[PDB]
Amino acid sequence: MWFEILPGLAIMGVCLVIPGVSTAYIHKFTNGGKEKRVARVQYQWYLMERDRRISGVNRYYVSKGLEN
Amino acid sequence: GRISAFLKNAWAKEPVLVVSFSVWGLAIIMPMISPYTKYASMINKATPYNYPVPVRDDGNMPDVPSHPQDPLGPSLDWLKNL
Amino acid sequence: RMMRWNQERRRLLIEDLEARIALMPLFQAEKDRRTLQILRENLEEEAIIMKDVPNWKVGESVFHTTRWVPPLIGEMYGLRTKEEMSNANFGFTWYT
Amino acid sequence: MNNYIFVLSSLFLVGCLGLALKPSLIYGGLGLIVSGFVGCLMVLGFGGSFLGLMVFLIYLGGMLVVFGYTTAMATEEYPETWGSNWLILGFLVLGVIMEVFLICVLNYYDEVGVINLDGLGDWLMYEVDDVGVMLEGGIGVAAMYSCATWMMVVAGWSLFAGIFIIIEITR
Amino acid sequence: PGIVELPTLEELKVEEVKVSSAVLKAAAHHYGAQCDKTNKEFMLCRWEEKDPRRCLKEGKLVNGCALNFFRQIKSHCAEPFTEYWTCLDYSNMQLFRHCRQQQAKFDQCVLDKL
Amino acid sequence: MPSTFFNLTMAFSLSLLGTLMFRSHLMSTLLCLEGMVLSLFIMTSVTSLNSNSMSSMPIPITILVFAACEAAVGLALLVKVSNTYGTDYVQNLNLLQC
Amino acid sequence: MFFINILTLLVPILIAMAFLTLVERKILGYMQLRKGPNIVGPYGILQPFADAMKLFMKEPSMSLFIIAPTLSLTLALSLWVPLPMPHPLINLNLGILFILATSSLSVYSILWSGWASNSKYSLFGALRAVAQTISYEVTMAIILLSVLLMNGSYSLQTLITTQEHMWLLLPAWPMAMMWFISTLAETNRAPFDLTEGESEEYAAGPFALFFMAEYTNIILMNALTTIIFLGPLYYINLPELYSTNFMMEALLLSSTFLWIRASYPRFRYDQLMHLLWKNFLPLTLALCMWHISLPIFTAGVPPYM
Amino acid sequence: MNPITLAIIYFTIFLGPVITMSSTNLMLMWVGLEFSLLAIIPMLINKKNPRSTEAATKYFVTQATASMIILLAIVLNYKQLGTWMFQQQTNGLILNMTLMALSMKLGLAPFHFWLPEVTQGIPLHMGLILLTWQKIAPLSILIQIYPLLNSTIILMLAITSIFMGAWGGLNQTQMRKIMAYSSIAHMGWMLAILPYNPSLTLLNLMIYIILTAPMFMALMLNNSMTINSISLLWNKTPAMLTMISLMLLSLGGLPPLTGFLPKWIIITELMKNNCLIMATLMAMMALLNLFFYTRLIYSTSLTMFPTNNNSKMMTHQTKTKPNLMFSTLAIMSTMTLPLAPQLI
Amino acid sequence: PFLDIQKKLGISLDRHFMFLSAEQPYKNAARCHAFEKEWIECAHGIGGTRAKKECKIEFDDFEECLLRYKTMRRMHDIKKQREKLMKEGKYTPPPHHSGREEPR
Amino acid sequence: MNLYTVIFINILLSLTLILVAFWLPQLPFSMKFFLVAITFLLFDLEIALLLPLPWAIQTIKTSTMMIMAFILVTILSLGLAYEWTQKGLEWTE
């Protein structure tokens, strides 16, 4: 009966769920636990290039704090 | 009577046009009615997409404040009280 | 509900822009000092680079103004590497 | 990825050249689509995201579509292909060689004018508001609704009249 | 035709803040009033005179004020301020919505002590 | 900028040649017109975004709309021609010389 | 990293398209009271690979012949790039306009196929389908131009923070009743699949490519609906939950398409163009004006970061 | 063409020039030009016959190239300075291109081989507009920018128009083509005087209009578009002759009429500015225009050609088309020389 | 202009952005605002031929701000000489130009 | 670089598929259509004019944007209704 379509429904479900979590976890692994910043404007890009310049490593996924 | 008959006919024959024209009328008309319209311009004037360059005090202008947190300037409290 | 939510979004936007407002001055001064150092270095190098030629000048303002002049990224990063010139030009335009 | 704009420019040049060396229309329309694509990409590299996407959405989707539509429904590529394409291809090759050598000639006389080759990457963006929101072409194109309303009303009238004109023509 | 004046690298060398954008965006509001006279005066100098090479002595004062501000915030109420920016920087656009009930705490601490 | 701009002007000139010289068709001419228009719109938007000017941006939109309508009426005329002669050739228009 | 992400974005969607062909066959069979494929493998999870091998085994202007299907498929795959799930692969302001462009383009393939095939028979249907697709893409674009005024930005992330509280269907359902239909025309699905109903030139391989892109566009338009008019739950700690609810609603829409394909007859071309030009376009314009006025006679004028 | 369409098209035609002039932006000018082009094409192609369609194709193609060229000029000026208007600091090549385009758009020579064909394919009530409400905006553009022009090529163009128009008019029988060549020549006169005093181009244009429009009314009367079809006017309606003869001699520019005054004061300006050689060429080659006006005067009035019997069945009838403004303009053309100072 | 209907009605439809330094929407000033504001003020009150010769010191600077032909050439000659030196083997670019530094 | 990578990847994948496909085995006119294409144009141009609302709305001259929008929409609808009444949407020859 109608309980024979699940072996395709669940398949499509998992294979449409994989890309989202893939992207999220991958962005997070790269940028160190925090998501990938976005720049709809020049303001955020200025912030990002500033953090890049002061990272001491030339990468922006480093937030310093008050110990600088 | 003729109008009423025509609409009693259209409301079964071709409603699409009735809905369209009613929506059109509502759109052209309500803005002149509602009280919450001007508030939009007030808001989009308040929104500071730029920097408010200040001025000097070589005169006796008492309106402008010497500090942001002071009360002598234009308020918008109605925004949060909305 | 859409209205009551859009208004709250406008309030949040005002908050963020007020933060940016309070921070603009600092950033302005940092940027100014940075570009001034940049030009000073371009000059300290230009000196030795083009001292051996005839009737050449040093920081010769191509204008007759005495007015300050927003310098071009061309001038500033014209002696640094393609890396920086492009990280400047195509930075916001190549998706972060 | 410094030669970007020069490359896109040469490709637009070549598309318009393949349209000027009138080939069979089926193999000229591809040149035109390439031309539009590359020109939009140039605009984008400069920073007119809105303009580039407007092009992709209107020029190609709106105009080239109907060009091909009308062409097919009202044209026949009669056997005028006495190796005409195979001839104009070598002719195009000769022209592109001419142009390459032409630029390699110019660069000698003109150095800081026509083209600056040693520093080509430079001199695309001159200044920019680093800390500034609201600096994208969306605002300039939205102008028409607050200031410059004449543009909008004039385009509206152009369409309002083009409808009548087309229909009164076709009959 | 005409020489241009410029300052020297060896001068205008102040010890910058070098703090991150998240922290700046978080602490801004208070720094909006605290250290406001100086910043407003500097913006006025920069808008009146288009000479950054003349509007410099009003930048070192700015940075000194900002540092003497972050210094008080380091002395008092540091951990609320650290957890705060670690909560902000998590997001992408660093919005003040996903951290509300981690904000009023820091605010009340800063108040009850300052 | 200058290099790409001179090249765009060259492309305009090439479309000019394409329109001013025929190869026994009409759609080719109209497509060369479209190429002209594209180059012009591009040069204008480039000039604007390079000067950082905004209020001058409506102009590309305006001229693009006008070129759309122009090419539309041109295609309508081409179609009337094909449907009253039998094809879209050019050598059929030997009339009016009398 | 990035290549890994592109693989995660391209391989699973092809897998899902295959198993979607399967699900179609099965549901149509179960609505026509039969089973469907249950033999080639357990409950029919190998018929798609069987079809692939068979097609690539079948024997047959090369330029058009290749560029058309390739173009269509590449567009259909690129359409996926800018989607949020919940944080996207490529955050693009103007993303939905990029979507519309890359969805409209495939008309070029449809048209080149005809202009190549000398068959008047083929140009007939080619023109018809091209015209219907064009005319429906028009409204597909205007609906967005009338809704997105709720979030003053053409982005696709802002949709989520917007729908945080409520959805986008309780309002604008006079549109969803359309955006859930034009999607049945651009896709040339039922009840507008006349382009495959009246037949009197696609070989095996290019047919496989065309069909791949067709069902990809199906999945993608359904995802666009699930994102626009059926806002999911964006609790930042649960991107998994976001993706999961998105999956669910996408499957629901993709089975609704099949309910439709089974139940209804097909539209006569003239009746169809009448439908559009005389029922949807007036309503569409008037509703766009309505949603333009709403943020003026109401404070709800949204921001632009 | 139903009334709504007719009204909208007439409105757009009356608009295009108004905007092209009242606007100080070159883009708006180009826009008005496109307006005229578009809104006019139909009025040419209404009959939908092959000749009309052909003429429409020619017209549209030429004017399209012209408009795109002017657009190129404007954009180059933008890149050069920033303003959307022409100043005194623009590389002369841009002006030369603008001038080539305006010429091709008017009918000047050697950009003129498309005007006679079109004006032969067209009826009268649209050729009239084609000659008298499309050559205005393109001339206002020049009125705005006369100082910084290239007198050399302007004069070469003008005199070339004089010669070619006259030499073609010596032959063309078709009255439409004759009128076209006359337009060419008079616009040559204008462009010749232009960069010295524009009011005189304004005057030459108004005069050419006042002489053309009534001629086209007298033609619209009978649809007689040929010499052997207009010679029968002395038997169809023997009244229009005493005015047609005058108007044609005027167009020629005979002193006691008014058509002379323009050439006269124009030569005066060119003599003040030391252009007497080209002035002499113009004055000694307007005589061929005068010739092929005299040769139609002959055919119509000074000698009576064989008529056709059914003209009796016609005369039994009546006709009340010829409105008042026809005679009004005819008179205010022929008998208004005493009021030249009040014209300047 | 030609037909001053606009000035007669005391209105404006196009002439409020005829040039560069008009009122841009969100106060974003253009590139050569100042040079334009000076060129116009010198070319006001007078007409044409006066300005085409008594405003060059204010217009050449403007055209340069707008195009920077002379700055292009300056930088070009500098880089050409530098390349020739690094070829002959006399230069040695320091770090701040050669790939790193201690930035802000 | 990212979109370049993605697009090259998609194109190369499609071409691998087609190369596999190729290796493993071893007319009068209808005025109505042109009129419809023309309607499509004259609507895409409206779309180009109309898209910028999400930024034209955040300005201060609401009394202007509201109006101009209504104007465009209503005049376009007028042209549409005229085309209808004059039978451009009937398909019967």
Residue numbers in the entry:
A (entry chain a): 1 to 68
B (entry chain b): 2 to 83
C (entry chain Z): 48 to 143
D (entry chain J): 1 to 171
E (entry chain X): 1 to 114
F (entry chain K): 1 to 98
G (entry chain H): 1 to 60, 67 to 206, 214 to 318
H (entry chain N): 1 to 344
Provide the authors' original text about this structure.
Mitochondrial complex I catalyses the first step in the mammalian respiratory chain, electron transfer from NADH to CoQ (ubiquinone) coupled to proton transfer across the mitochondrial inner membrane, in order to generate the proton motive force (Δp) and drive ATP synthesis by oxidative phosphorylation. When Δp is high and the CoQ pool is adequately reduced, the driving force for reverse proton transfer across the membrane is sufficient to drive electrons backwards through complex I, from reduced CoQ (CoQH2) to the flavin. This reversal of the normal electron transfer reaction causes a substantial increase in complex I-mediated production of superoxide, which is then dismutated to H2O2 by Mn-superoxide dismutase in the matrix, and termed here “ROS production by RET”. Furthermore, mitochondrial ROS production contributes to the tissue damage associated with cardiac ischemia–reperfusion (IR) injury.
To determine how the ND6-P25L mutation affects the structure of complex I, the complex (ND6-P25L-CI) was isolated from the heart mitochondria of ND6-P25L mice, and its structure determined by single-particle electron cryomicroscopy (cryo-EM). The final cryo-EM density map reached a global resolution of 3.8 Å from 26,638 particles in the final reconstruction. The map revealed a fully intact complex matching WT-CI with all 45 subunits clearly present and was described using a model containing 8063 residues (96% of the total) developed from models for the WT enzyme. Comparison of the map and model for ND6-P25L-CI with published maps and models for the A and D states of WT-CI showed clearly that it is in the D state. The ND6-P25L-CI and WT-D structures match very closely overall (RMSD value 0.59 Å) and reveal only subtle structural differences in the vicinity of the mutation itself. The variant residue is located at the very start of ND6-TMH2 (on the matrix side of the membrane), pointing towards ND6-TMH3. In ND6-P25L-CI, TMH2 leans away from TMH3, relative to in WT-D (and WT-A), increasing the distance between them. Most likely this occurs because of destabilizing steric interactions between the variant Leu sidechain on ND6-TMH2 and residues at the end of ND6-TMH3 and the start of the adjacent ND4L-TMH2, notably ND4L-Met27. The structure of the ND6-P25L complex indicates how replacing the Pro residue with a Leu pushes ND6 TMHs 2 and 3 apart, allowing the upper section of TMH3 to rotate more easily and facilitating the spontaneous transition into D-like states. On the molecular level, ND6-P25L complex I functions normally for NADH oxidation but is incapable of catalyzing reverse electron transport.
